[PDB]
Design an enzyme around this catalytic site. Structure first.
Site, mmCIF file in Angstrom:
data_model
loop_
_atom_site.group_PDB
_atom_site.id
_atom_site.type_symbol
_atom_site.label_atom_id
_atom_site.label_comp_id
_atom_site.label_asym_id
_atom_site.label_seq_id
_atom_site.Cartn_x
_atom_site.Cartn_y
_atom_site.Cartn_z
ATOM 1 C CD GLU A 11 -15.304 -14.107 38.009
ATOM 2 O OE1 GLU A 11 -15.898 -13.020 38.087
ATOM 3 O OE2 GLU A 11 -14.959 -14.606 36.921
ATOM 4 C CG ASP A 20 -14.465 -12.857 29.706
ATOM 5 O OD1 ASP A 20 -14.426 -11.792 30.347
ATOM 6 O OD2 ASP A 20 -14.742 -12.910 28.490
ATOM 7 C CG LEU A 32 -10.606 -8.487 31.369
ATOM 8 C CD1 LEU A 32 -10.099 -7.100 31.089
ATOM 9 C CD2 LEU A 32 -10.394 -9.412 30.198
ATOM 10 C CG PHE A 104 -14.171 -9.454 41.041
ATOM 11 C CD1 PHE A 104 -14.281 -10.442 40.075
ATOM 12 C CD2 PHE A 104 -13.003 -9.367 41.789
ATOM 13 C CE1 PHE A 104 -13.209 -11.322 39.829
ATOM 14 C CE2 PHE A 104 -11.934 -10.242 41.564
ATOM 15 C CZ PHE A 104 -12.037 -11.218 40.577
ATOM 16 C CB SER A 117 -30.373 -1.457 41.182
ATOM 17 O OG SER A 117 -31.013 -1.956 40.021
ATOM 18 C CG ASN A 132 -34.178 -1.510 38.915
ATOM 19 O OD1 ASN A 132 -32.985 -1.226 38.892
ATOM 20 N ND2 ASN A 132 -35.078 -0.875 38.166
#
Ligand code: CL
Ligand code: CL
Length: 164
Positions: A11, A20, A32, A104, A117, A132
Site C-alpha cells: 500500500e 487509490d 480509504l 484489507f 478459491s 483460480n
C-alpha cells in the site's frame, strides 16, 4: 516479515489525501476515506477519523494509528465471517497473511465471494487455487500486487516480498 510489513509494501505510505487505484480518496497506508467524489467529504471523514482538523494532512504516527486499526478490523472481519474463518484457521501463518492482505484490500464481503478459491485453499491445493485466484477482476486490475499475494498462497514463503 509480518502482516504489517507486507501491507506497508503493498500500500505504500502517503501523508496527504490521494486517490487509490480505483479513484477513491485515501490516506496513510491504504486507509480509504470515502467512495464519494467529494474532496470535502473526504476531508470531513479524515477529521472524524483522526479527531482533529487535519486540512487533508496527517503525521506518520497518525497514519500508523489508522493502519493498526485497519489491520485489526480486517482480522476481526475474517474471524467473524462464517466462510472465512474456517479457511483462515486451516492455513499456516504465512499463507494466513495473504488472506488478511486480500481482506484489507477488498473487504470481508468481497473476499468471501471467492468461493472456489477458498475451497481449494482449505483443501491445500496450492497450484489450483493460484490459477483460480488469477481469474479475477482483482488480478487484472492490480496484477503486480495480486501476483505477490498469489505467490504467497502458493508457496507459503515470503519470497515475493524479498528484495523490495
Ligand atoms: Cl477472468
Ligand atoms: Cl498492482
Amino acid at each position: 516479515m509480518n502482516i504489517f510489513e507486507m501491507l506497508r509494501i503493498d500500500e505504500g505510505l502517503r501523508l496527504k489525501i490521494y486517490k487509490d487505484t480505483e479513484g477513491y480518496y485515501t490516506i496513510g497506508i491504504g486507509h480509504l476515506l470515502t467512495k464519494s467524489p467529494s474532496l470535502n467529504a473526504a476531508k470531513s471523514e479524515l477529521d472524524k477519523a483522526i479527531g482533529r482538523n487535519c486540512n487533508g494532512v496527517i503525521t506518520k504516527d497518525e497514519a500508523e494509528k489508522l493502519f493498526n486499526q485497519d489491520v485489526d478490523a480486517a482480522v476481526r472481519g475474517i474471524l467473524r465471517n462464517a466462510k472465512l474463518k474456517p479457511v483462515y484457521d486451516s492455513l499456516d501463518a504465512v499463507r494466513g497473511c495473504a488472506l488478511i492482505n486480500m481482506v484489507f484490500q477488498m473487504g470481508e464481503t468481497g473476499v468471501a465471494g471467492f468461493t472456489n478459491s477458498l475451497r481449494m485453499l482449505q483443501q491445500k491445493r496450492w497450484d489450483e487455487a493460484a490459477v483460480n485466484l488469477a481469474k479475477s477482476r482483482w488480478y487484472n486490475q492490480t496484477p503486480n500486487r495480486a501476483k505477490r499475494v498469489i505467490t504467497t498462497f502458493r508457496t507459503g514463503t515470503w519470497d515475493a516480498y524479498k528484495n523490495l
